Amino acid sequence: VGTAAMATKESTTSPSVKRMLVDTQGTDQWISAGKAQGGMASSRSQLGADIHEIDNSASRCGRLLDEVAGDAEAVAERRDEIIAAMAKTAKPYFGDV
Amino acid sequence: IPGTASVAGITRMDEPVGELLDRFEQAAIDEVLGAGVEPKDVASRRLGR
């Protein structure tokens, strides 16, 4: 059992993370790649492997990047939306260096 | 990054791992004991020989 033991007392997940994990109730059916069902989402990783994520701002940013990544012109078209999406997460875009 | 099926399993906060796994095993303990089979006395849990 991996998932059921995340909200344990000895675990070092953030208390807000633990509360959010308790609050969300997942699905019993399969989740298509890039989509979200029942507060749960499935998106690709850095190398393209699929990941299971909770539907939060970071997951939305990751799904948007998966939508965008693979074409420089695609990044350029919706740059500001991507900037805002990262700014919503915990790994935000640096300033205009 | 949790699993989609077992997130619904998480219900309360800060439950120790020992109690969680003990309840996990006690579910099957009660399920088997419902059949009316008494246990046998064993020295330890391995019992390899």
Ligand SMILES: Cc1cc2nc3c(=O)[nH]c(=O)nc-3n(C[C@H](O)[C@H](O)[C@H](O)COP(=O)(O)O)c2cc1C
């Ligand atoms: C947050 C998280 C991290 C995991 N990391 C690994 C890992 O590094 N290597 C591995 O083989 N399995 C990893 N697993 C999968 C576990 O070995 C196990 O299959 C999974 O936790 C069971 O999920 P379940 O509670 O939905 O049944 C991970 C699972 C989760 C939820």
